Design an enzyme around this catalytic site. Sequence first.
Site, PDB file in Angstrom:
ATOM      1  N   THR A   1      -2.495  -2.932  -8.358  1.00  0.00           N
ATOM      2  CA  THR A   1      -3.108  -1.908  -7.399  1.00  0.00           C
ATOM      3  C   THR A   1      -3.418  -0.523  -8.242  1.00  0.00           C
ATOM      4  O   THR A   1      -3.979   0.167  -7.590  1.00  0.00           O
ATOM      5  CB  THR A   1      -2.402  -1.500  -6.349  1.00  0.00           C
ATOM      6  OG1 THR A   1      -1.161  -0.936  -6.751  1.00  0.00           O
ATOM      7  CG2 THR A   1      -1.909  -2.708  -5.474  1.00  0.00           C
ATOM      8  N   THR A   2      -3.274  -0.594  -9.491  1.00  0.00           N
ATOM      9  CA  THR A   2      -3.843   0.444 -10.293  1.00  0.00           C
ATOM     10  C   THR A   2      -4.533  -0.107 -11.546  1.00  0.00           C
ATOM     11  O   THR A   2      -4.313  -1.300 -11.836  1.00  0.00           O
ATOM     12  CB  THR A   2      -2.387   1.482 -11.064  1.00  0.00           C
ATOM     13  OG1 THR A   2      -1.562   0.624 -11.399  1.00  0.00           O
ATOM     14  CG2 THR A   2      -1.799   2.254  -9.786  1.00  0.00           C
TER      15      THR A   2
ATOM     16  N   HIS B   1       8.721   1.370  -8.560  1.00  0.00           N
ATOM     17  CA  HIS B   1       7.785   2.766  -8.430  1.00  0.00           C
ATOM     18  C   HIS B   1       7.445   2.472  -6.953  1.00  0.00           C
ATOM     19  O   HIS B   1       7.472   1.438  -6.257  1.00  0.00           O
ATOM     20  CB  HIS B   1       6.617   2.710  -9.182  1.00  0.00           C
ATOM     21  CG  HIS B   1       5.619   1.687  -9.079  1.00  0.00           C
ATOM     22  ND1 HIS B   1       5.541   0.827  -9.793  1.00  0.00           N
ATOM     23  CD2 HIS B   1       4.623   1.717  -8.228  1.00  0.00           C
ATOM     24  CE1 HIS B   1       4.441   0.111  -9.347  1.00  0.00           C
ATOM     25  NE2 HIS B   1       3.696   0.523  -8.382  1.00  0.00           N
TER      26      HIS B   1
ATOM     27  N   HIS C   1       7.518  -1.173  -4.937  1.00  0.00           N
ATOM     28  CA  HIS C   1       6.993  -2.314  -5.630  1.00  0.00           C
ATOM     29  C   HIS C   1       7.995  -2.370  -6.666  1.00  0.00           C
ATOM     30  O   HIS C   1       8.305  -1.426  -7.438  1.00  0.00           O
ATOM     31  CB  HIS C   1       5.370  -1.818  -6.389  1.00  0.00           C
ATOM     32  CG  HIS C   1       4.431  -1.931  -5.446  1.00  0.00           C
ATOM     33  ND1 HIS C   1       3.263  -1.510  -5.471  1.00  0.00           N
ATOM     34  CD2 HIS C   1       4.515  -2.395  -3.985  1.00  0.00           C
ATOM     35  CE1 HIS C   1       2.455  -1.435  -4.673  1.00  0.00           C
ATOM     36  NE2 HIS C   1       3.242  -2.061  -3.491  1.00  0.00           N
TER      37      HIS C   1
ATOM     38  N   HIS D   1       4.724   4.260  -3.787  1.00  0.00           N
ATOM     39  CA  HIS D   1       3.402   4.917  -3.256  1.00  0.00           C
ATOM     40  C   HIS D   1       3.631   5.702  -2.042  1.00  0.00           C
ATOM     41  O   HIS D   1       4.232   4.914  -1.093  1.00  0.00           O
ATOM     42  CB  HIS D   1       2.297   3.937  -3.215  1.00  0.00           C
ATOM     43  CG  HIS D   1       1.957   3.122  -4.305  1.00  0.00           C
ATOM     44  ND1 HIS D   1       0.855   3.345  -5.314  1.00  0.00           N
ATOM     45  CD2 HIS D   1       2.845   1.837  -4.818  1.00  0.00           C
ATOM     46  CE1 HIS D   1       1.141   2.441  -6.429  1.00  0.00           C
ATOM     47  NE2 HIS D   1       2.046   1.361  -5.993  1.00  0.00           N
TER      48      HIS D   1
ATOM     49  N   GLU E   1       0.454   0.795   0.799  1.00  0.00           N
ATOM     50  CA  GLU E   1      -0.852   0.211   0.129  1.00  0.00           C
ATOM     51  C   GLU E   1      -1.368  -0.710   1.106  1.00  0.00           C
ATOM     52  O   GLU E   1      -2.469  -1.016   1.610  1.00  0.00           O
ATOM     53  CB  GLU E   1      -0.615  -0.109  -1.429  1.00  0.00           C
ATOM     54  CG  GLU E   1      -0.387   0.929  -2.363  1.00  0.00           C
ATOM     55  CD  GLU E   1      -0.809   0.948  -3.700  1.00  0.00           C
ATOM     56  OE1 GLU E   1      -0.256   0.110  -4.378  1.00  0.00           O
ATOM     57  OE2 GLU E   1      -1.704   1.792  -4.116  1.00  0.00           O
TER      58      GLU E   1
ATOM     59  N   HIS F   1       0.870   9.288 -12.296  1.00  0.00           N
ATOM     60  CA  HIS F   1       0.529   8.500 -10.821  1.00  0.00           C
ATOM     61  C   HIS F   1       1.443   8.389 -10.036  1.00  0.00           C
ATOM     62  O   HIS F   1       1.389   7.714  -8.912  1.00  0.00           O
ATOM     63  CB  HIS F   1      -0.739   7.775 -11.107  1.00  0.00           C
ATOM     64  CG  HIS F   1      -0.254   6.694 -12.121  1.00  0.00           C
ATOM     65  ND1 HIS F   1      -0.436   6.391 -13.704  1.00  0.00           N
ATOM     66  CD2 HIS F   1       0.496   5.461 -11.938  1.00  0.00           C
ATOM     67  CE1 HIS F   1      -0.283   5.484 -14.202  1.00  0.00           C
ATOM     68  NE2 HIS F   1       0.364   4.611 -13.292  1.00  0.00           N
TER      69      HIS F   1
HETATM   70 ZN   LIG Z   1       2.618  -0.234  -6.818  1.00  0.00          ZN
END
Ligand SMILES: [Zn+2]
Length: 258
Positions: A196-197, A92, A117, A94, A104, A62
């Site tokens: 957020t995951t 990581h 992040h 997004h 996000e 992901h």
């Molecule tokens: Zn993240």
Amino acid sequence: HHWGYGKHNGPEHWHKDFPIAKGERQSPVDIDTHTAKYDPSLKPLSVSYDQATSLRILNNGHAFNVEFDDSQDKAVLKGGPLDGTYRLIQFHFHWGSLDGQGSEHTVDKKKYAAELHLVHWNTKYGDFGKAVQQPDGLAVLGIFLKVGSAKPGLQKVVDVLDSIKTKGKSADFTNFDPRGLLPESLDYWTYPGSLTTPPLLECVTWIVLKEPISVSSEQVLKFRKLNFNGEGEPEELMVDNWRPAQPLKNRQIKASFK
Ligand SMILES: [Zn+2]
């Protein structure tokens, strides 16, 4: 079946396996800059990354994660709204399928092209797995990316993505200096939130920097060539791996600046 970002397993479905998705301190949020409260009792961030030791880069299905040696106080975050010392464990990104989406967090409903992040955990809980069970267990530094000029410090990351195209692949990734990913200013907003995951645990103190960094159209394009899928499976491009804004509820966003 498993959670993801597709039509059939995306964010709107997550609550079924993870009920805390509808909780009281979920992330990300929209940062309304006019209702954010300047707090003069907030300190400057202290980012000490000069002894950081990066180990590995991994496609986990992901996102991709650059991992750090967190066995000692090598790369730490202190100050700001935090009490105590937080160790860097990974960072990581997004990102989106188009330049107009990908972040996000949003700022007055503005979406950026991607969001970085940098994940840290509170050393008083001894390990990351203990930290995520605590309301003050993580601090995440969020940095927005806009498309403009290239970011030279990002290029080493971009150049190794071919080697980790598919889920489960990893590569040695040593001697990467995360200081090359920071903006000039460390002015920030902060609020209590969550991962957020999945498992969406409500253990994060968010610190979102006001100043984006700029990357080139070519650099973000390489992000979008990664795959959600494993090798030998049908190709699904790893794009739009972002959770939409969640309700703020009984929370206040504070600003380190006026
Ligand atoms: Zn993240």
